Amino acid sequence: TVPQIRAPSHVPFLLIGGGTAAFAAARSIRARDPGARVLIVSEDPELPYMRPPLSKELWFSDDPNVTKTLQFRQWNGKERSIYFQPPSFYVSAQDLPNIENGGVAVLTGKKVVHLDVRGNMVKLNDGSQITFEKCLIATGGTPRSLSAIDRAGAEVKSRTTLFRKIGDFRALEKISREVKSITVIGGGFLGSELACALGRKSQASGIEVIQLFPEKGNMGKILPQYLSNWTMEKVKREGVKVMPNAIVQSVGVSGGRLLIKLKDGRKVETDHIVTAVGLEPNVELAKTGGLEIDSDFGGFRVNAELQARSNIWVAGDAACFYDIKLGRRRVEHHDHAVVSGRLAGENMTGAAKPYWHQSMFWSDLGPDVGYEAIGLVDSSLPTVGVFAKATAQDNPKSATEQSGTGIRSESETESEASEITIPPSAPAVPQVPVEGEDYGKGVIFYLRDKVVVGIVLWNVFNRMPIARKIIKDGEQHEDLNEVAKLFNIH
Numbered sequence: 317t318v319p320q321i322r323a324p325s326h327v328p329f330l331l332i333g334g335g336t337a338a339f340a341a342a343r344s345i346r347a348r349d350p351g352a353r354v355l356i357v358s359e360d361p362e363l364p365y366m367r368p369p370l371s372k373e374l375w376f377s378d379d380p381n382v383t384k385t386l387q388f389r390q391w392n393g394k395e396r397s398i399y400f401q402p403p404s405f406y407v408s409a410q411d412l413p414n415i416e417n418g419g420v421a422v423l424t425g426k427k428v429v430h431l432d433v434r435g436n437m438v439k440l441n442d443g444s445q446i447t448f449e450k451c452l453i454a455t456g457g458t459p460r461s462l463s464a465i466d467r468a469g470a471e472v473k474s475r476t477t478l479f480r481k482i483g484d485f486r487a488l489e490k491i492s493r494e495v496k497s498i499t500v501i502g503g504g505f506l507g508s509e510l511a512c513a514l515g516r517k518s519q520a521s522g523i524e525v526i527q528l529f530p531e532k533g534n535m536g537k538i539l540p541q542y543l544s545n546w547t548m549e550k551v552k553r554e555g556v557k558v559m560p561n562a563i564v565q566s567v568g569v570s571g572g573r574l575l576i577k578l579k580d581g582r583k584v585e586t587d588h589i590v591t592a593v594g595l596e597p598n599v600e601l602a603k604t605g606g607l608e609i610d611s612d613f614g615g616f617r618v619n620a621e622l623q624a625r626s627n628i629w630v631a632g633d634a635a636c637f638y639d640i641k642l643g644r645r646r647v648e649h650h651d652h653a654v655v656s657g658r659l660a661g662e663n664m665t666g667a668a669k670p671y672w673h674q675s676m677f678w679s680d681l682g683p684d685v686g687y688e689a690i691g692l693v694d695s696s697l698p699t700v701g702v703f704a705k706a707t708a709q710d711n712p713k714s715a716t717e718q719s720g721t722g723i724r725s726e727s728e729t730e731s732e733a734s735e736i737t738i739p740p741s742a743p744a745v746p747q748v749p750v751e752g753e754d755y756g757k758g759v760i761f762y763l764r765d766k767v768v769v770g771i772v773l774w775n776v777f778n779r780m781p782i783a784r785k786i787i788k789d790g791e792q793h794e795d796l797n798e799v800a801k802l803f804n805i806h
């Protein structure tokens with residue numbers, strides 16, 4: 317067996333990229349047009365898989381075999397495959413045009429590098445060509461790097477990982493068992509999940525874990541300062557040296573270790589760096605395809621139907637879409653990937669439906685801390701937070717036990733509450749006098765006009781439909797403590 321040239325071929329439905337959005341689009345097309353012939357072409361050799369477990373549950377397991385099988389343990393102890401479907405669900409490219417009732421084929425280890433819109437064709441990196449009738453671009457993005465690491469030498473670039481894939485979890489996991497110290501650069505949800513995860517391994521290994529970022533505290537661009545600060549102390553307590561207000565001036569090699577120099581005088585000595593500083597949408601096809609990239613937000617600009625050009629749609633992290641409440645925007649949400657992929661797939665079969673979904677986001681920092689967000693969440697906005705003591709059910713683990721899944725967009729559902737009526741206050745709880753240290757859950761309302769434009773929920777689950785409805789209706793609430801009763805915050 318030797319390398320060979322693929323003959324030109326044709327496929328009714330071509331999906332460029334094999335991630336969450338591509339997979340959801342393939343199922344949608346198959347549901348809408350039974351017998352459909354769908355081909356996914358994907359650069360990474362792996363079959364389609366969900367990403368959330370990579371910075372999360374896969375680090376919380378004592379079984380060495382999980383790194384190989386990727387059958388991760390949810391917080392409720394129940395196993396789940398990181399893959400959407402196993403190999404048997406798919407067919408090979410070669411067989412697709414001949415199989416009865418059609419199917420979903422997958423061609424991994426191949427990259428589409430040229431899109432010809434008017435000729436309905438693409439070219440792969442190996443020179444072969446595939447004509448299509450309908451095409452979805454769902455190429456995701458590539459992790460951003462740090463400028464200082466880019467200007468940095470071979471030695472340091474060889475000791476920095478960007479965190480996005482299976483390969484990254486595997487390498488970072490191995491490194492956590494080989495070196496004395498690892499630094500996470502990035503204060504966002506993802507960098508924070510990685511810090512907690514290594515801090516947990518640290519309990520057994522004794523490795524040093526540092527997390528550094530330029531904000532005053534974790535997720536500082538998103539959470540109000542008080543909760544950002546609470547969060548920062550929480551992460552630190554997982555055994556992480558957190559360094560806020562840190563701007564990387566340069567990185568170099570000293571003593572055989574990495575030497576990161578900060579603008580303010582500080583210096584960090586460490587053996588490996590993982591960055592989590594955001595994403596660049598994969599838009600290389602915009603050029604041959606004559607597609608518009610959004611100059612303000614990045615990604616492919618699409619219309620209400622997720623369409624970019626004739627017979628071309630985009631979904632997932634790669635799309636700059638028109639949010640029904642916020643206007644042009646792009647997100648990195650698992651929910652959006654699934655919903656938008658499904659809708660694109662439906663539109664590929666002729667539906668012409670607008671994307672009116674309000675995408676949600678969630679983050680877990682271990683089984684005991686969970687956040688959910690929706691709409692415009694920006695710490696520069698005026699905000700109203702309402703809090704209460706947590707009940708036993710108010711944590712990511714219980715939310716996983718109740719629903720049987722850890723992927724929060726699944727358990728929350730994609731729906732929107734049909735009506736909002738402020739329920740009666742709950743029965744009084746006999747208690748000693750309550751202090752701020754005693755709260756463990758809450759809702760934070762983000763405002764613009766006296767209208768709620770965004771919501772972050774802290775340890776409140778199964779209420780996302782209600783948060784969607786409050787944001788959609790756009791009422792001026794006279795008293796947000798009454799509305800918080802909708803989130804069982806009393």
Ligand SMILES: Cc1cc2nc3c(=O)[nH]c(=O)nc-3n(C[C@H](O)[C@H](O)[C@H](O)COP(=O)(O)OP(=O)(O)OC[C@H]3O[C@@H](n4cnc5c(N)ncnc54)[C@H](O)[C@@H]3O)c2cc1C
Pocket residue numbers: 332333334335336337338357358359360366367368369370371426427428429454455456457479480481506598601631632633634647648649650651653676677678679680
């Ligand atoms: C580690 C991590 C944890 C996360 N946790 C959460 C969370 O808990 N909650 C939440 O809401 N969201 C979370 N997210 C975000 C969510 O997983 C993403 O929004 C989602 O993966 C985007 O899916 P996609 O299909 O749009 O893009 P991708 O998943 O990136 O898929 C794109 C695929 O296309 C391939 N590709 C790119 N270019 C080409 C090309 N030209 N030709 C062929 N193939 C190509 C790439 O190899 C890639 O496989 C997390 C993300 C990461 C990385």
